[PDB]
Amino acid sequence: DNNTALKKAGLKVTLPRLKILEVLQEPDNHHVSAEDLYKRLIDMGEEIGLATVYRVLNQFDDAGIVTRHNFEGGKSVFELT
Amino acid sequence: DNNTALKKAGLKVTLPRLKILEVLQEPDNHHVSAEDLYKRLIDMGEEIGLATVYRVLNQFDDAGIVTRHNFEGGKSVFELT
Ligand SMILES: [Cl-]
Ligand SMILES: [Cl-]
Ligand SMILES: [Cl-]
Ligand SMILES: [Cl-]
Ligand SMILES: [Cl-]
Ligand SMILES: [Cl-]
Ligand SMILES: [Cl-]
Ligand SMILES: [Cl-]
Ligand SMILES: [Cl-]
Numbered sequence: 001d002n003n004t005a006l007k008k009a010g011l012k013v014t015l016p017r018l019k020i021l022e023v024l025q026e027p028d029n030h031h032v033s034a035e036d037l038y039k040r041l042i043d044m045g046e047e048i049g050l051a052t053v054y055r056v057l058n059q060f061d062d063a064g065i066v067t068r069h070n071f072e073g074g075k076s077v078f079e080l081t
Numbered sequence: 082d083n084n085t086a087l088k089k090a091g092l093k094v095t096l097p098r099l100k101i102l103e104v105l106q107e108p109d110n111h112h113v114s115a116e117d118l119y120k121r122l123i124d125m126g127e128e129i130g131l132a133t134v135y136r137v138l139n140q141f142d143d144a145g146i147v148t149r150h151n152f153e154g155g156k157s158v159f160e161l162t
């Protein structure tokens with residue numbers, strides 16, 4: 001229940017937050033960059049922009065919903081905590 | 082005093098942390114991306130890697146030392162809070 005997950009993390013339920021959570025819950029996207037998560041959203045037929053993806057992920061990090069990893073070469077990925 | 086800011090923020094004082102705070106305090110770098118901050122450090126003769134810059138900035142975000150902004154196109158800029 002991602003509605004409950006968002007409430008439990010102190011965030012208003014919105015479509016981008018729900019759809020971003022959904023992608024993070026796909027096996028192939030267990031770890032995902034903001035750019036790849038955006039591409040998956042495009043593939044799904046969503047119209048959620050890349051800045052929104054970044055904003056949501058960074059809010060999720062603050063809320064303790066996701067973990068950020070920073071790799072060599074400035075490449076970054078997110079996963080659910 | 083940058084040492085105090087770091088200590089009160091709960092972070093060990095290290096040379097990269099101090100150098101990163103110093104770039105953020107330069108008028109021209111009031112707002113800067115990790116990449117641009119890294120470029121400036123290179124210009125200063127520093128040997129701080131890009132992944133370290135990202136890691137330090139994200140720690141600074143969590144400590145409430147910097148504010149993060151996400152612009153159109155996925156551009157991710159920092160400034161001191
Ligand atoms: Cl898999
Ligand atoms: Cl697959
Ligand atoms: Cl696989
Ligand atoms: Cl998973
Ligand atoms: Cl894992
Ligand atoms: Cl990391
Ligand atoms: Cl690197
Ligand atoms: Cl893990
Ligand atoms: Cl100048």
Ligand SMILES: [Cl-]
Nearest residue numbers: 107108109110
């Ligand atoms: Cl100038």
Ligand SMILES: [Cl-]
Nearest residue numbers: 106107108111
């Ligand atoms: Cl300034």
Ligand SMILES: [Cl-]
Nearest residue numbers: 130131132133
């Ligand atoms: Cl590095």
